[PDB]
Amino acid sequence: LPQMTQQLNSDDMQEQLSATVKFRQILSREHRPPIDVVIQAGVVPRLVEFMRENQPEMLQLEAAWALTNIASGTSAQTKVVVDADAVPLFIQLLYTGSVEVKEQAIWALGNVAGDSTDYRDYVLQCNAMEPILGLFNSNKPSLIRTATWTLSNLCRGKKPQPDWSVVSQALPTLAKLIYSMDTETLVDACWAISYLSDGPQEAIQAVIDVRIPKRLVELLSHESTLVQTPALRAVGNIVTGNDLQTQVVINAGVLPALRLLLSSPKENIKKEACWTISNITAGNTEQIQAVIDANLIPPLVKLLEVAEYKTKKEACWAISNASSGGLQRPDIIRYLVSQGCIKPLCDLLEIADNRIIEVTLDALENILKMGEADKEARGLNINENADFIEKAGGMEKIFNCQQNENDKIYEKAYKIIETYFG
């Protein structure tokens, strides 16, 4: 190392190149590259020098390669490279460099961007977006992957949400990347899109205008859960928007697609599928009816019954939001009850957290108001739904809620028992 460090500091171009190649090779070890000793040798800032505008490209590639092996190490190791002010140089190399040079720069920039939110912003402010977006006009798959990966690292994060004026510039490229033949590329593009869709209406509408929604919906039935997961996450973030934005996703045909995801052997997919659906049933009466017409209630009721809690929780919201539209269209409630949602709802009370008990009690109450409403509409002397709940053992569970510490809950419980089971 002392010997190499010498060559590197030599003024002989040929000797500098000889040294950088060496530092690049040791930093390329698959085992445990002596990154820390290299940093301890103080040759980082020198290697950074070799990436300057007028250095020979071979020297630039070797130096960037070496620095990239370092920047892709631990966070500490990344800080060193960043502090040597390598980022601005990696970025100009994105414009100038050969494919090989570009592959190192984009990788290194991706690691800096994915290190933390402050580095994410640093990179964005160094204006990496322009040169990064130009990489997609190339035809090398591997280079496009890294680039897409780095792009997702720039879009990710919600405490400091990334500078939207900058990151939104990626939407057009992203809209094309989700048609990629490369699976890894597809995956990261969908993750990036989900990150951009994890924001206000402005963000969501932006994703809608570049016509990404329909492609996202087609990707829900991709053979791989690695593609399905981020695609669903993105769809889920989009339907969190307003009713108009959600209808866009619905006209793209997301409902029939969701029907398949509810059967996914992947628990988190069933979970986010129920989550997505609950943000659609949280919409207007016509959107709730659409969920009904797509035959999404039956599988939902089933999950409410057998899935893990984290999924049941989601199924409940979906069903409870659906029952909210029952005040208007009473037949929605009638349909929910027909699909056997009462038993699952009652049982849930026994294992749910307080927020879910509130949600579940809302659904049960809406169900009771309905059964009460057409009980009067007829000369009947019984509230069928109330009777339904009693049989399912729900009465006893609602009674038990009277001892819950939460005011909203126990008060909701007393009112229910008193009103329908007195």
Would you say 103 or 198 has its CB closer to its own copies?
Answer: 198
Taking the complex as a whole, how short is the minimal distance between the CB of residue 52 and its own copies, in angstroms?
Answer: 31
How far apart are the C-alpha atoms of 163 and 121, rounded to whole Å?
A: 7
Out of Co ion, its own copies, none, what residue 310 binds, judged by CB under 5 to 8 A for its kind, is its own copies
Taking the complex as a whole, how short is the minimal distance between the CB of residue 166 and Co ion, in angstroms?
Answer: 21
How far apart are the C-alpha atoms of 316 and 303, rounded to whole Å?
A: 9
Which is nearest to 129 in space by CA: 78, 179, 182, 168? 168
Out of Co ion, its own copies, none, what residue 142 binds, judged by CB under 5 to 8 A for its kind, is none
Task: Give the count of beta carbons closer than 10 Å to the beta carbon of residue 143.
Answer: 18
Exposed e or buried b for every residue in 202-220, given b needs 16+ CB within 10 A? Answer: ebbebbbebebbebbbebb
Contact call for residues 399 and 417 (beta carbons, < 8 A): yes
Residues making contact with its own copies (CB under 8 A):
74-75, 116, 157-159, 198, 229, 233, 267, 308-310, 313, 350-353, 403, 405, 407, 411, 415, 418-419, 422
Task: Give the count of beta carbons closer than 10 Å to the beta carbon of residue 292.
Answer: 20
How far apart are the C-alpha atoms of 135 and 368, rounded to whole Å?
A: 60
Out of its own copies, Co ion, none, what residue 422 binds, judged by CB under 5 to 8 A for its kind, is its own copies
Which is nearest to 390 in space by CA: 420, 350, 361, 366? 420
* Number of residues located near Co ion, criterion CB under 5 A: 1
Out of Co ion, its own copies, none, what residue 378 binds, judged by CB under 5 to 8 A for its kind, is none
φ, ψ dihedrals at 166, nearest 5°: -85, -60
How far apart are the C-alpha atoms of 11 and 15, rounded to whole Å?
A: 8
Site string for Co ion, 286-325 (x = CB under 5 A): ----------------------------------------
Contact call for residues 410 and 404 (beta carbons, < 8 A): yes
Taking the complex as a whole, how short is the minimal distance between the CB of residue 347 and its own copies, in angstroms?
Answer: 12
Per-residue tokens: 147:
């680039």
Which is nearest to 128 in space by CA: 156, 106, 97? 106
Segment near Co ion (CB under 5 A), from 107-115, 117-125, 250-258, 360-368?
Answer: 107-115
Taking the complex as a whole, how short is the minimal distance between the CB of residue 192 and its own copies, in angstroms?
Answer: 13
Q: What is the SS3 assignment for 182?
A: coil
How far apart are the C-alpha atoms of 107 and 105, rounded to whole Å?
A: 5
Would you say 115 or 198 has its CB closer to Co ion?
Answer: 115
Would you say 76 or 244 has its CB closer to its own copies?
Answer: 76
Q: Is the dihedral of CA 309, 269, 333, 407 positive or negative?
A: positive
Out of its own copies, Co ion, none, what residue 313 binds, judged by CB under 5 to 8 A for its kind, is its own copies
Would you say 87 or 356 has its CB closer to its own copies?
Answer: 356
Would you say 89 or 273 has its CB closer to its own copies?
Answer: 273
Taking the complex as a whole, how short is the minimal distance between the CB of residue 116 and its own copies, in angstroms?
Answer: 8
Give 261: exposed, middle or buried? Use CB within 10 Å, 0-12, 13-18, 19+. buried
Segment near Co ion (CB under 5 A), from 115-123, 161-169, 249-257, 398-406?
Answer: 115-123
115 lies in the site for Co ion, by CB under 5 A: yes
Out of Co ion, its own copies, none, what residue 159 binds, judged by CB under 5 to 8 A for its kind, is its own copies
Distances (CA, A) of 94 to 54, 98, 107, 144, 277: 14, 9, 11, 13, 42
Would you say 74 or 338 has its CB closer to its own copies?
Answer: 74
Out of its own copies, Co ion, none, what residue 405 binds, judged by CB under 5 to 8 A for its kind, is its own copies
- Residues 3-42 contacting Co ion, CB under 5 A: none
Distances (CA, A) of 352 to 8, 160, 322, 371: 65, 33, 19, 25
Site string for Co ion, 341-380 (x = CB under 5 A): ----------------------------------------
Q: What is the SS3 assignment for 317?
A: helix
Out of its own copies, Co ion, none, what residue 352 binds, judged by CB under 5 to 8 A for its kind, is its own copies
Would you say 130 or 308 has its CB closer to its own copies?
Answer: 308
Taking the complex as a whole, how short is the minimal distance between the CB of residue 137 and its own copies, in angstroms?
Answer: 30
Would you say 45 or 160 has its CB closer to its own copies?
Answer: 160
Contact call for residues 231 and 270 (beta carbons, < 8 A): no
Would you say 202 or 407 has its CB closer to its own copies?
Answer: 407
Would you say 180 or 240 has its CB closer to its own copies?
Answer: 240
Which residues of the chain form contacts with Co ion (CB under 5 A)? 115
